[PDB]
């Protein structure tokens, strides 16, 4: 019922997926062996949205793990939670793209997308009513970025009447993990802009700040970072995974938050985030949940909404609560924080309520805001790319495997046009 | 699964390879005789498995004179190596690049190419070549040129990494050193993806100051260079929180067809008695590695600008503190990057801590950093070498030897003009320019 | 009742039959010694079709084994599972045919053929109502191709009102086991298309691809390659050996599959084919079995069906299954793949259901489709024979044993005529 | 059951046969005295069982001089051979083709034929003949050509295979080889189904380079010959997944009645200490056997085309990788087939691993490849040898020894033009032709 397919690309994709399926197995009470061991029947009432049933009451994730380098697959196969995936899903190449868009989009891309499209067509056969696609990847690496672009284009070609959500790990503004980010970022951004539905931009240094300050962790690792990202994603999907007083789903979110075809870049957030020690000194309640959601410090993207205006906002709550407090207090938010809301969208508000709380907590909430503060991120990336390209550095190996200069020119022009439209729509009357 | 092969040329190459393969044997937990008592693939990258429990290296030892190869045969690593690869001629080139490239070099190049083809067809997912050779050595330079030409002809687009031995400015052991250097550099400028530089005087300074050893035989220097080699290769050989490959190294370090001359550095390099009184934190080892007194090429980057940097951390490591150290070093004043490279950093992490050899000069560590920097401080070394060569050649010394061994004058003239142009382009790119 | 006699010519036949009569014993619960030790009584109600009852409840196979050289019998006679054959059946000659057509059809095989016809006529003078003959020969060697063709013409005369099915092994396109394949192949087909009813063309590396890719085996020996040809062989004749909801038999397939007398070259296929570890992660049900049939990856003849159109298709299901799924999906196959079916045979699908599952599996099915993709198989063989005969290579060793260049004129001309009519029917309207 | 007899003539055949029949008893577990300590027929095709537990061979040892046969009687293999078969004359032929074919050949040819019909009637399913004769000598060339006339008439159409000893181009034991060779080939061209060519100078390179032995006596050289001999009949004596009989190669490797001159090859041939460091896989021994440095005739195949091929594996061999390894050979361009032979390979497999005789140069091995390729590279062998003989006949050197012993000058001209005809036809068919 409303089947959804998960696609993971690059090392980030595989790691985030491992943590995410950890979260899903814990939520639905699935043993690492693959056999149900829980007690509640509400979880099994709707178990087939992500998992698939198999003989001897086994459950197999609808996962498509694929990466050019085989190290990530070797790690995930040798480690725990490798006994429930189906081996046919595990696609791996011969060598990583080496942080090269050309190698990730033209050289191994052909064969790899052929194989992965065959696997996708096999997977979509079992689905009863396909709902949409999920793709978690990074815009910084080569294989994940370029091959995810090619896969997205071909999947859009095959399935026009369907939606896909992309969880992109945007490169951090303050620090760069690699050297040549801007070329890859600009090319992937242009391709996504032309051929995607919605994008939940997630940053890395903002999540570092969130994990250090709010959660008070001395040495946070990628395990904790991916834990938080997986929690956000599970909170997003629980709306149609679980019953609730006021339900919502992916198409509802998309129609509520894409007012224009070229404006679908979002900013997520999660609440509450409390340390193990400081959890007993605060009473969990809707006021502090909403107030913690609506402060920039608890924003998962490295941008400050104080410099922009919330174009639209979605709040997906969980646990058991009451719409009275939910609405009356988000109303208080709208009244108090009016100056940071757009004027030509009266009632720029969407709220949904689930019924099953997150594990080990009374109630939580997920925020998804479409704002104009991503404009600074796009313009900073544009500045870096235009400087590095006017020097013409690193260019002749992007040229050496298929590309040439006019593609870079057109990508820069398209991205700049998007920036200009974003700004002039923020500053409309 | 991704296979890289190592070609060791000259006496320096053979000794460095002996140290490097010793270090690999301790790293992968294999006995010298081939048996053994994350881990198991790893050794499948280097150690090809035979029918029995023995593993054999993918090394190709080649030399003209037979004495050093006889020594390595008689050494304690006599069972490990496959006896066929140890290719020996009969007489050395005697510090004559002409002899090592034209006269005798063509009579053994066929055999070494046949063995290279056999080993490369034996493997499955070949990655590239690692060439361990010196510059002063006539056989080293001549075979470097010949093997680069032959391998580039045979295999089109693969990785070709070199671990050279740069001639020292003040320390000197040869007289035809400028001639060998100019000829080999001109010949292999266009036939190498990325060539690292190592100098002996710099390693001697490092071993004297940082480690405080008064009797630094060649064993310690070879141990150091082997440690850098193992650190750069541990990314392929092991799994980590953020992996990096040789293609990544190339595409993140070298920005231009000709400017592919980085330099290596290792950290921490501290003694045994000083180990107890130190903390060995990520930030402090990062600062020590970026310290200009630890670089392994006798050129202080204060005279130039950094252009690209790659750092591999191995052991227990947190990406947050890695990020903090990188950001603070970026914001520091003395380190200066180029304007057109707003992001000049590439970080890799590995989950395998380095292992110290028994009886070694270094001490056991839980964190290690290897740094590879493409900068403009090598321009001064190129200029000094060019000046020495021009001064020597201004009155045609040893040219009778070189010409008698099948050479001309156009080769010298074109090598001179080629390195003049290369130095000019290097300086022009490194220096800041308006717009 | 409805008796059948099984013939094996050549080295392959004695090797294929070495495992064919292994699975039949397992199906009917027959010990190697020859005494029934089964429990279910549904096996013995029709046991006389293949096995022959003798004194003291000992059953002996109704098959004859023959070769010109004695090496093959010494393996099966002295080896295990050789205790149940009757020693009279083991006909062997003096010397091998030496990969020569003439030595197997004129010179050496003429002596032994009188010693095997007198066994065939003796073979079922006790057989109540003969259904037909099964022939398991090869098209590459001399004894299997040469005499096995001679045996067909002699059997055709004594039993004209009968059917025979040849489970031939047509030679491989990429690899030739022997140098002179095209001479033996073309000289054999010229007499096959005259006096045989139906033919199962099978390649060898088509089994290599299936075993390596689908079954995930690294070292497939002939013990495992021939084990899959046995499964297809048992599936075709399981309809008249066991009860079924919708039964078929060997005479039913021939009329449904041979629209014209010269067109009886088929393409077998089996499903499911799952490894020993990747089977717990897949639930066996009717949907994927039909999907696994029609993809070019899983077919036992190395010929891509995408370049041709199916003329007729027959699927023989097994196991226990509701019929609705069996036929509701062959409409979807006909609808989704409507471009791969001939137009002037509406409803070109035959189906049949048995009621006994294969050992160790919940259900399975067999596909036998008379396609036009055989067109490319005969072109390639006739192409190799065209160039080789022009230089008269190896010809000076065929003319010396009865044949002549006049014989080769008919073989190429009849092949050229046959392959043309095998194609212009596809292009007909 | 299917029986083949071996005719050994001359000290070449007897010395080869001394080690040739040394190997069969090892393969079938036969003690030198005939006692015993797959199995149970194995030996029934070679070892005709007698009344007692003894098994006697089916060999016909014949020579003119009583020298070489003497040590066979007095050697360690004294009881095994039946004392009647060792036919000996009184004096040799002295490298004179005329003496061994007209004068002293006839006075003894009637004695060997008597033992042939005696042994041919003793067997039931006789298949063919094995001949072990050289070319340079007199009793090995003139006398065996008499047999080819005598066996042909007595038995019309049976297998006639010769394991010759081709005279070497540079190596030359005798001085009248160009006279003996051309006279032999012309007479036995039309009386041979197929003649495997073996050169003596080629086996030195195999033993010196591939096996690394500095003292290759005839004992070690002849050991490398019996391995192919035991390989051609390795399918008759043992059961395999894909069997081959002596008419298979006879049918697969003879495209024309005249072009029936293949050349043997064996693999693997590696030393004892080098065994531990080799993987010894099916994929490489297919390549190892095919390399031009492993053939047993000094004629590099790169100069010509491969008319056909034939492979006989054994041991723990799986027919897939054999299919895989053979398939990739067509892609590699050191092989070059003729246009009218799109399919040009034959494969045979066996379940018996080869066994190494104790004290031999080879090491224990689980696989074996024995390639028999008819190729155009042998065309240069006839032309080069034809040039030497044509130089002799110009001034009629050494002729007076031949004419006075019972031959005519006209007979010499016919043998000369016959090799020109064979060379013309063999090259014309090998080279491409219009339409
Ligand atoms: N949030 C998060 N990001 C990660 C994690 N691991 C890696 N990344 C990001 O992923 C980027 C690396 O790009 P990838 O596509 O994974 O590169 P790769 O998988 O090594 O293969 P190539 O693209 O060919 O280099 C880095 O810039 C990191 O910012 C992780 O655990 N969590
Ligand atoms: N790092 C390091 N360098 C060495 C070592 N041994 C020799 N070298 C360098 O190698 C140079 C000598 O050149 P070689 O390649 O060894 O010359 P060769 O091996 O004698 O052969 P020819 O060049 O023909 O004479 C010296 O200038 C040293 O700088 C060593 O153990 N470690
Ligand atoms: N599928 C399959 N084919 C086989 C097997 N064994 C042999 N073959 C085929 O059989 C062919 C050999 O021809 P045969 O007719 O059997 O030859 P023979 O029986 O040995 O006797 P001759 O024809 O005289 O050589 C080869 O081309 C193989 O392709 C097997 O185990 N499985
Ligand atoms: N492979 C091999 N060849 C040998 C051996 N001994 C002799 N020959 C060859 O035999 C040739 C000599 O001619 P033979 O036919 O043997 O002469 P013969 O057998 O003594 O008979 P006569 O010519 O009458 O003396 C030499 O050129 C050698 O090449 C041996 O042990 N092994
Ligand atoms: Mg990667
Ligand atoms: Mg030297
Ligand atoms: Mg046979
Ligand atoms: Mg003699």
Residue numbers in the entry:
A (entry chain B), C (entry chain D): 1 to 429
B (entry chain A), D (entry chain C): 1 to 37, 40 to 42, 47 to 441
Publication excerpt:
Microtubules are tubular filaments composed of αβ-tubulin heterodimers, which adopt a pseudo-helical geometry. Microtubules are stabilized at their growing ends by the so-called “GTP cap”, a region enriched in GTP-tubulin as a result of delayed nucleotide hydrolysis after GTP-tubulin addition to microtubule ends.
At 20% αE254Q- and 80% αE254N-tubulin (referred to as 20%Q + N-tubulin), mosaic microtubules grew steadily with the speed of recombinant WT microtubules which grew at ~21 nm/s. To test whether the different tubulin mutants incorporate in the mosaic microtubules at the same 20:80 ratio as present in solution, we conducted mass spectrometry experiments and found that 20%Q + N-microtubules indeed consisted of 18.9 ± 4.3% of αE254Q-tubulin and the rest being αE254N-tubulin. First, using TIRF microscopy, we performed titration experiments of 20%Q + N-microtubules to measure how much mGFP-EB3 bound to 20%Q + N-microtubules. mGFP-EB3 revealed high affinity with a dissociation constant of 14.0 ± 2.6 nM, similar to that observed for pure αE254Q-microtubules. At an optimized 1:4 ratio of αE254Q and αE254N-tubulin, mosaic microtubules nucleated and grew as straight, 13-protofilament microtubules like WT microtubules, but were stable and bound EBs with high affinity due to the presence of GTP-tubulin throughout the microtubule lattice.
